[PDB]
Amino acid sequence: MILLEVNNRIIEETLALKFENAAAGNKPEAVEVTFADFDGVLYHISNPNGDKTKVMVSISLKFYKELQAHGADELLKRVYGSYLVNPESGYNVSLLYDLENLPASKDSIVHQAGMLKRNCFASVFEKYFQFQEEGKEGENRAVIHYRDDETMYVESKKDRVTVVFSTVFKDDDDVVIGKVFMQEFKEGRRASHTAPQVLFSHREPPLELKDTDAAVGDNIGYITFVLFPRHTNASARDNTINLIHTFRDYLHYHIKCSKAYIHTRMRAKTSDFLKVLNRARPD
Amino acid sequence: AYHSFLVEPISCHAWNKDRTQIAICPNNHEVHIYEKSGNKWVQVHELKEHNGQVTGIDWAPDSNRIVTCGTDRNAYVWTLKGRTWKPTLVILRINRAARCVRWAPNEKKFAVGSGSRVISICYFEQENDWWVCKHIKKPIRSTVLSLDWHPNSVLLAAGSCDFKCRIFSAYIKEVEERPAPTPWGSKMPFGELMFESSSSCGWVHGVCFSANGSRVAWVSHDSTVCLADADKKMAVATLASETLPLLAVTFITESSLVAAGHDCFPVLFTYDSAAGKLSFGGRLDVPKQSSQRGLTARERFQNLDKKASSEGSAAAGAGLDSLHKNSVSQISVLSGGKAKCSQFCTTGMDGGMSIWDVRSLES
Amino acid sequence: GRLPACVVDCGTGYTKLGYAGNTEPQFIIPSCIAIKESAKVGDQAQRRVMKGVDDLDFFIGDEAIEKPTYATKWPIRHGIVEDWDLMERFMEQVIFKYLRAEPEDHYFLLTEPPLNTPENREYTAEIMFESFNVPGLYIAVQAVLALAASWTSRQVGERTLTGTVIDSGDGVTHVIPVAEGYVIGSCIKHIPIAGRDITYFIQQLLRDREVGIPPEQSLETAKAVKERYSYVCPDLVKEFNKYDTDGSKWIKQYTGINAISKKEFSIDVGYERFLGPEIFFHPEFANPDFTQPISEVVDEVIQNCPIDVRRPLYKNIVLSGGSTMFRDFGRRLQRDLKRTVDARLKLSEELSGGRLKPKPIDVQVITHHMQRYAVWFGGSMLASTPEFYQVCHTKKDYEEIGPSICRHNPVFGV
Amino acid sequence: ETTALVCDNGSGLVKAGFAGDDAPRAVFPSIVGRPRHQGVMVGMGQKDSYVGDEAQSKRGILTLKYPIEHGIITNWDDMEKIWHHTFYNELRVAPEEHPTLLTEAPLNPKANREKMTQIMFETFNVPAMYVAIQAVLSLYASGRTTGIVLDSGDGVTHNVPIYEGYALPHAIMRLDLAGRDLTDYLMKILTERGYSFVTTAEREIVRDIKEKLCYVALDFENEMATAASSSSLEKSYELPDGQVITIGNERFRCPETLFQPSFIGMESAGIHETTYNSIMKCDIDIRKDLYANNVMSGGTTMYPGIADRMQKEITALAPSTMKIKIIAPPERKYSVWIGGSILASLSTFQQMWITKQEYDEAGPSIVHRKCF
Amino acid sequence: ETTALVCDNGSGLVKAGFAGDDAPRAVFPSIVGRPRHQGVMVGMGQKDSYVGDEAQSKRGILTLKYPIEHGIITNWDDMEKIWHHTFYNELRVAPEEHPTLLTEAPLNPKANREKMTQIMFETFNVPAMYVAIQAVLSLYASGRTTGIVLDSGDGVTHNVPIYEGYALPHAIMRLDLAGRDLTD
Amino acid sequence: MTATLRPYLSAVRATLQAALCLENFSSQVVERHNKPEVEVRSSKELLLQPVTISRNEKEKVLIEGSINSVRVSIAVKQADEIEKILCHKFMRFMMMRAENFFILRRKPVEGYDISFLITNFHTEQMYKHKLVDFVIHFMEEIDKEISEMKLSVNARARIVAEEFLKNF
Amino acid sequence: WXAXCPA
Amino acid sequence: WXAXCPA
Numbered sequence A: 001m002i003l004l005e006v007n008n009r010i011i012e013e014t015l016a017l018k019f020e021n022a023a024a025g026n027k028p029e030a031v032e033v034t035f036a037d038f039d040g041v042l043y044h045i046s047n048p049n050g051d052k053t054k055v056m057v058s059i060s061l062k063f064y065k066e067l068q069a070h071g072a073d074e075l076l077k078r079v080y081g082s083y084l085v086n087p088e089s090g091y092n093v094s095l096l097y098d099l100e101n102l103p104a105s106k107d108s109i110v111h112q113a114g115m116l117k118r119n120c121f122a123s124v125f126e127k128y129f130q131f132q133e134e135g136k137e138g139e140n141r142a143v144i145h146y147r148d149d150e151t152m153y154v155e156s157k158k159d160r161v162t163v164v165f166s167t168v169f170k171d172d173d174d175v176v177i178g179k180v181f182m183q184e185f186k187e188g189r190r191a192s193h194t195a196p197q198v199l200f201s202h203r204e205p206p207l208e209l210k211d212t213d214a215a216v217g218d219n220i221g222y223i224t225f226v227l228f229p230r231h232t233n234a235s236a237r238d239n240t241i242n243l244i245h246t247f248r249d250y251l252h253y254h255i256k257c258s259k260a261y262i263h264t265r266m267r268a269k270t271s272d273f274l275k276v277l278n279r280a281r282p283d
Numbered sequence B: 001a002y003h004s005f006l007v008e009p010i011s012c013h014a015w016n017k018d019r020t021q022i023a024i025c026p027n028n029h030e031v032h033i034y035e036k037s038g039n040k041w042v043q044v045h046e047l048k049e050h051n052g053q054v055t056g057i058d059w060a061p062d063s064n065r066i067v068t069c070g071t072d073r074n075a076y077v078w079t080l081k082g083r084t085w086k087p088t089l090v091i092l093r094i095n096r097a098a099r100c101v102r103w104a105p106n107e108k109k110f111a112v113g114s115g116s117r118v119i120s121i122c123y124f125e126q127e128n129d130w131w132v133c134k135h136i137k138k139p140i141r142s143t144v145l146s147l148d149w150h151p152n153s154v155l156l157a158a159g160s161c162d163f164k165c166r167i168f169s170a171y172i173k174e175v176e177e178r179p180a181p182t183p184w185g186s187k188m189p190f191g192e193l194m195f196e197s198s199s200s201c202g203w204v205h206g207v208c209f210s211a212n213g214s215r216v217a218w219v220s221h222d223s224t225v226c227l228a229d230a231d232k233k234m235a236v237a238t239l240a241s242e243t244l245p246l247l248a249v250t251f252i253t254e255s256s257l258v259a260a261g262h263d264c265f266p267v268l269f270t271y272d273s274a275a276g277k278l279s280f281g282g283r284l285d286v287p288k289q290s291s292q293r294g295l296t297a298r299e300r301f302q303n304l305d306k307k308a309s310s311e312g313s314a315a316a317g318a319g320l321d322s323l324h325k326n327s328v329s330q331i332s333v334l335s336g337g338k339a340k341c342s343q344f345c346t347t348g349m350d351g352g353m354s355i356w357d358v359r360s361l362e363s
Numbered sequence C: 001g002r003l004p005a006c007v008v009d010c011g012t013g014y015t016k017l018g019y020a021g022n023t024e025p026q027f028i029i030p031s032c033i034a035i036k037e038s039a040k041v042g043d044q045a046q047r048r049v050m051k052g053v054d055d056l057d058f059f060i061g062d063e064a065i066e067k068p069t070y071a072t073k074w075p076i077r078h079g080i081v082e083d084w085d086l087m088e089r090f091m092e093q094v095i096f097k098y099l100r101a102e103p104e105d106h107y108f109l110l111t112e113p114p115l116n117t118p119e120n121r122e123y124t125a126e127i128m129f130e131s132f133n134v135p136g137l138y139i140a141v142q143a144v145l146a147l148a149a150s151w152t153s154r155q156v157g158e159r160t161l162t163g164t165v166i167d168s169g170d171g172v173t174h175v176i177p178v179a180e181g182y183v184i185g186s187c188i189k190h191i192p193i194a195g196r197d198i199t200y201f202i203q204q205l206l207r208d209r210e211v212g213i214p215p216e217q218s219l220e221t222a223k224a225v226k227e228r229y230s231y232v233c234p235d236l237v238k239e240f241n242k243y244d245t246d247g248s249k250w251i252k253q254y255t256g257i258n259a260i261s262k263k264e265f266s267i268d269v270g271y272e273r274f275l276g277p278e279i280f281f282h283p284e285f286a287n288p289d290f291t292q293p294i295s296e297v298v299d300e301v302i303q304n305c306p307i308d309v310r311r312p313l314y315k316n317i318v319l320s321g322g323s324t325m326f327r328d329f330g331r332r333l334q335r336d337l338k339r340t341v342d343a344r345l346k347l348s349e350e351l352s353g354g355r356l357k358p359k360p361i362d363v364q365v366i367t368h369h370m371q372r373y374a375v376w377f378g379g380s381m382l383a384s385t386p387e388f389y390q391v392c393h394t395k396k397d398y399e400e401i402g403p404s405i406c407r408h409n410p411v412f413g414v
Numbered sequence D: 001e002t003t004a005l006v007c008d009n010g011s012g013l014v015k016a017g018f019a020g021d022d023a024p025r026a027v028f029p030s031i032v033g034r035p036r037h038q039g040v041m042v043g044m045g046q047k048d049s050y051v052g053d054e055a056q057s058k059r060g061i062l063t064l065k066y067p068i069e070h071g072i073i074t075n076w077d078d079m080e081k082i083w084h085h086t087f088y089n090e091l092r093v094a095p096e097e098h099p100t101l102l103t104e105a106p107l108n109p110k111a112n113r114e115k116m117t118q119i120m121f122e123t124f125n126v127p128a129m130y131v132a133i134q135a136v137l138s139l140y141a142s143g144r145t146t147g148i149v150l151d152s153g154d155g156v157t158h159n160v161p162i163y164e165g166y167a168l169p170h171a172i173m174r175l176d177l178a179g180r181d182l183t184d185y186l187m188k189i190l191t192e193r194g195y196s197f198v199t200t201a202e203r204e205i206v207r208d209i210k211e212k213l214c215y216v217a218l219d220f221e222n223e224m225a226t227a228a229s230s231s232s233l234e235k236s237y238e239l240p241d242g243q244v245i246t247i248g249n250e251r252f253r254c255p256e257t258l259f260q261p262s263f264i265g266m267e268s269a270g271i272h273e274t275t276y277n278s279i280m281k282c283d284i285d286i287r288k289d290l291y292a293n294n295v296m297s298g299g300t301t302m303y304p305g306i307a308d309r310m311q312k313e314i315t316a317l318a319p320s321t322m323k324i325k326i327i328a329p330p331e332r333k334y335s336v337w338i339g340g341s342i343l344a345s346l347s348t349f350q351q352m353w354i355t356k357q358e359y360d361e362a363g364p365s366i367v368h369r370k371c372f
Numbered sequence E: 001e002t003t004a005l006v007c008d009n010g011s012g013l014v015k016a017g018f019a020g021d022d023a024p025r026a027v028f029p030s031i032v033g034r035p036r037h038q039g040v041m042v043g044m045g046q047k048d049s050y051v052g053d054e055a056q057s058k059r060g061i062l063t064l065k066y067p068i069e070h071g072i073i074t075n076w077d078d079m080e081k082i083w084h085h086t087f088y089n090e091l092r093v094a095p096e097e098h099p100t101l102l103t104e105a106p107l108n109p110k111a112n113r114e115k116m117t118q119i120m121f122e123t124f125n126v127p128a129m130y131v132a133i134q135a136v137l138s139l140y141a142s143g144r145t146t147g148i149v150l151d152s153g154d155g156v157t158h159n160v161p162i163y164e165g166y167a168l169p170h171a172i173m174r175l176d177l178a179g180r181d182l183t184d
Numbered sequence F: 001m002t003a004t005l006r007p008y009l010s011a012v013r014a015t016l017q018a019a020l021c022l023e024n025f026s027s028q029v030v031e032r033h034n035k036p037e038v039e040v041r042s043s044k045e046l047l048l049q050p051v052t053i054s055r056n057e058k059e060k061v062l063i064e065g066s067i068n069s070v071r072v073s074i075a076v077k078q079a080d081e082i083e084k085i086l087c088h089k090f091m092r093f094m095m096m097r098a099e100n101f102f103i104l105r106r107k108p109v110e111g112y113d114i115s116f117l118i119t120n121f122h123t124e125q126m127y128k129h130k131l132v133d134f135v136i137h138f139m140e141e142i143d144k145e146i147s148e149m150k151l152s153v154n155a156r157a158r159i160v161a162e163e164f165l166k167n168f
Numbered sequence G, H: 001w002x003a004x005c006p007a
């Protein structure tokens, strides 16, 4: 994997295993499993009651309150139709599949359910882009800090949109490696034509975040991506959303991959060192 | 006059009276005997009943007996009975180890430089058919690495690793008689300290005596050479240089001196008559060695797989015979005694052997 | 709303995968790993050194079989591993793509064969703490997990800690007894023969006894063992002459499908229906070094432990493991053990006379579900226990002491 | 801490040495080559990447690529590799022991400067460093305070008018034309003659050919007419394979591209026209001094007769009432390095350096305000 | 497992020996002959097939046929027979004890390589093996890393330019002309 | 390295050559043995005083001495945190395959970087000047290795950034 | 360069 | 061979 995927393959696999035997009579196959994914959010699949004819999926979003305050009426009918019901687990969006009714599609529904986290996350970014597109008075900027102690802020003014990232590294070992990783992020531009500007700042927080109570400290960097309609229209919106949401885990995974790469290089060099040493043993 | 007897190192060497037989420890739980064949060497016998490592051998010019003094806190006195060799158990009462051994000129007793802080002297007894052992432990405070004997056989020097090189006075009245007057002292009874080193000068790895019995010399790990002249009022002479530590001691005549060690080649010294000072002599063995190599098309590719292809066996020590002659273990003598020594031999840790001369150089 | 930990059961064969607090291992995939290696010749001074991002250009899992341009290279070989870089690559791939778990906020439990050397465990723990930065780690033998899973067979409420487990494996099957929670360290033996060399023998015999198969699709043909195609046999020669006499009804047929030209190919089924599974009680066929049966090994290991524990141990033998799925295995083992133990008792009674009659020793084999996987549920219960969060080795312990915290073994002590 | 190292990242060559020496201690071209074939033999796992004279020697099985293109860096990995090679293998001096001096062409992007400073301060942790201009160092080497610089390097040609104690940043002109374009045009014309050269190895071969058998023509039309009588101008060169190539008009054709950029299709003017425009944009009084002093430097201005042609063209363009003098030192190739060494040796410059403490507290933007 | 065996299936001759020796221990031509007459005498039921120096000695009553033609095998039974003969009768070394090394000319069909590998791994169950090129081994023997090879064998003549540490697969030329055409 | 590292290397090489002398000494304290004396630290009789060859605060070396063995410990010149991490990981990977070396230890001395070991069992079955030459060569090449690792990681970060930014 | 010319 | 030459 290079671009971290957005479709959790666990739900895809379990739903495929369930549906491939769906047309086999009165087959309940009681299921009750708990999962976890990036952003420190817990999933849960479990039948509502003894009736096993219905399967339910739920989320435990950390910043759920902001989503509820904003209102996601768009998400209740566009991607998810009539198979969405009020929250049960922890006041967080939960859906269920009605097996008694014939499920016509097999892959489309599974794919739609696979991107649940990003599907709910987009409710704010797409709405801000709509606000700036529609000509409505620039909606008040918002700050969305997810499970990680870091913070996310967005400003949606006329003629452009903005987004800023706050980064926090826990272990002392990876702090410097991540700093080096993000140092060259703001400059690599020789292979991109229609791409947004990128900048890095750690000592001086941007003037936008002074009033906002976002991630403020000392060992915290900042990354901002300037947005323009040429790469934020109705066509190139999903790709940008996927890239930004999968930014954090992308950085993490590629840091670990670099660690493995350097491990391999040093392991290779050990052989040369041993070859040099072997000059001491006799013929 | 270099020769090789085994790739692996060799602990100690011993020779017969006619210089026709050799003793080589293979660094294993046994000892081998090599004999001359025209101008060639070949194995003859194979003696092995010791389960430990052998570290000391010696030969009797007349008795034709061989002693194996090593690990296992034991020691066997080999004797020849017809055309085969048989052991002879001995008791030494040791608890740690034993490294060096040496017989006596008159072949009546032998001493072991045990590693148990003790020095043992034994003599033959026909009553119990055994070899009784006495002990000297009064002044000793550490291991002893080198032992040498005096003509009369009453004076013993036991080098140690405690800055000292001391002469002793052992006299077993059972198999010994009163020695003639000696300048050193009074030939006091067994188990006493006669005299000690004047001061601290490195450890001790060897000792050498003189026919007149008036001069004693030893070497040290501190790149120093000493010469205890007892003829005068215990005059002591010293010398030093930049050479690496020496690990052997021997001299030719009343004034000469020879030694060798990690320098990889012999070094010669000398002693003045009245000046009470020594001097230096460089590479009395020969001027220098030579080096050579070959193409070895097979080797050119074989070495690249493990080592670098351009690599080779050439070394800076090839020119001055410092390539293969890894260190020197000890020294011996060929003809007569320590008076003229027309030829001298040395042992090597490389697993081989070599001979030299003192007159073929012809200054 | 505490996050669940992660449960993983690595091994030579199909690696089990999933989360704790769940009743089904969601992901069960082989150990096959792809790589963009090819034909260089300088392969011992630069094994791979893939330029740029080609290092990660490799797939994993069932999808890795159907990539006909790389190399399918199994990293594990009956526990011991030669090169562990592939293992690290597989671990990162699984944790990210499949599990999708952040190591810095999760606890990982790992399982290794009992014979695993201390060095491998120490270095894998070091690798984990250095790269993944997992807050907690814990490694334990798989026998206890199987024993815990065995409770589901019947009467879960009735606590039964005593017993013994003979687990299978792709390259190892081990014997480990349990005596009321405490196992015996010295009474453990490692069996080299396992469920892989059996298939090697099957294919070796088949390549000469039959023709009509391609070299590539051999193992898929050799996997008739996993089918109904192998029954165990109380007697060997009897069934041999049974087949050599009739040889008409007892012979089965294969109708596999080629994976290249989509052309059907068929071959008959012969003596291998039983010989393979019979190799377990006659390992001498495959491994010449280990000419030693299994049942007698079981009795010997059960006879090298204190008296008070010998009795209950024979009563609880758990049928857990893939290689144990063969039919009638339990009957054969039970009958053999009963015969030998009764003979020993009779010999003991013969020397000292008496009109008494000791109550016969009872040996029973239990058949149940969970046989394919008995380690995953044990790991789930391991994670669910709060004491696990306290026993798990901490970061600061590895920070300066080193990775030696994971060196604890059940057969060592000074 | 006794001396400093001056490194000139020339567009086609690298010059380095100690501060104080009159000649460089390391002169190798900027080549970062990688193998192009597969490799079969087993007794060699050698150096996946190649740099320096090694790359030049075994260029026949490598895809040579120049890290720097027309004065601006394109691949940072190659530049870091060459820096490491020069610092360790050739100089064998640790970065911490002594500081480093860097030079770059004028009117370069600030991104390159910031990245170079960040890499130097972070990777090699040099105690201090500085960034300067090749033309000013050329002035320092020439021992003069007033004049106009013709820094026609392998990648960039530029001029910077100067006066006593001050410069004129508003009269700086930079031309992308340089030796690489001349080599490309030479290859194109050598094709018209009948000799074909495409790959980079033949690029180096043609570069050597131009270095050895090229010169400028005082009059283009007269030289062409004399070429029509081609019996005294053709010359022969020996290729590595032994083939002999006869070169005629191409000797004086490619250099004329400098005075006639229209040959390559560039809508610009020649070096003479650009220098005339730059001097005219200056104040009237300093025009006399600028005319009286015209320093030139770089590896593209060693063609015999170039000075005479430039003098003739400038006098023809300039009014014919004063005297125009051209100064052509015979060591203009290393003038920049000599100037850098002299500047480093200056006592007053020992405090103008940029150290790690101030760089870390302030940031990469400090170098921007440091002498522009 | 102390050494390995190197076998060169030359178009007209077979070379084999231990890894380390400077000279081959078995040098016999590749001949697989069969009787051409009927046979009358009764005190002989001998060896319907003949191979090796035996075939050369009694070639007057046999139809000699070369199993390998111009570098490509035509009859697999003959090649397996010669392999068995060389392994058992001459070398007297079991395949399992040591691995085997095989060489072949360049630009040969992949079918030959696959069949040879399959037969070696299945019939003799050799622990391991490898396939190489005669020219590269010629370089190794010559103790050089750069040059051009003129491997004019009995069945095929080919050249393979080489440079330090690398080869040039795009400049390989193979000519069918060889000793057999010269003999004809 | 003439003006930067040559004198340091010469001094340390001379010290090693002088202290590389070794001999076999039968155990004096524990029954019958020939185990290394430096590690045991039983008798002060055989031990020789430690020596150090250094020129900066953060880089150091230590030279021990004894009859049976001579021990040498080095401290590398590491400045940034990345340098420390890379040195630690590289040394650990060297430890993991130290068996084939027959010279190297299994864990560095506390508070110091990697250390080596010599013995009379490794002086005859192996050459003498080659071992010191290899130790020296490692001392020089450590800086090259760390710089190469640093540029490699920087290039990896650059390539990943470039690969991600293209999608936008 | 980024715009105009290559570099 | 199959096409060209015999083998």
Ligand SMILES: Nc1ncnc2c1ncn2[C@@H]1O[C@H](COP(=O)(O)OP(=O)(O)O)[C@@H](O)[C@H]1O
Binding pocket: C010, C011, C012, C013, C014, C015, C168, C169, C170, C171, C172, C195, C196, C225, C226, C227, C321, C322, C323, C325, C326, C372
């Ligand atoms: N139903 C079955 N019949 C025969 N063999 C089976 C069956 N299920 C698994 N196996 C065999 O058991 C092996 C897997 O056992 P397992 O212990 O899960 O591997 P691992 O040791 O990595 O955990 C497989 O190689 C397979 O051949």
Ligand SMILES: Nc1ncnc2c1ncn2[C@@H]1O[C@H](COP(=O)(O)OP(=O)(O)O)[C@@H](O)[C@H]1O
Binding pocket: D009, D010, D011, D012, D013, D014, D152, D153, D154, D155, D179, D180, D207, D210, D211, D212, D298, D299, D300, D301, D302, D303, D333
């Ligand atoms: N003897 C020469 N005659 C003419 N041109 C030369 C000569 N030597 C080099 N050159 C040219 O000058 C260039 C190199 O000189 P140099 O000044 O180092 O370029 P840079 O400005 O990057 O330092 C080469 O590209 C070459 O074309």
Ligand SMILES: Nc1ncnc2c1ncn2[C@@H]1O[C@H](COP(=O)(O)OP(=O)(O)O)[C@@H](O)[C@H]1O
Binding pocket: E008, E009, E010, E011, E012, E013, E014, E152, E153, E154, E155, E179, E180
């Ligand atoms: N002494 C010789 N003189 C000339 N040609 C020879 C000689 N010996 C063999 N040959 C020729 O070389 C051929 C065999 O050489 P060889 O290299 O073993 O063929 P291959 O390459 O298939 O092993 C024979 O066919 C023969 O024509």
Ligand SMILES: [Mg+2]
Binding pocket: C011, C012, C013, C168, C169, C170
């Ligand atoms: Mg298993």
Ligand SMILES: [Mg+2]
Binding pocket: D009, D010, D011, D134, D153, D154
């Ligand atoms: Mg320049």
Ligand SMILES: [Mg+2]
Binding pocket: E009, E010, E011, E012, E153, E154, E155
């Ligand atoms: Mg041939």
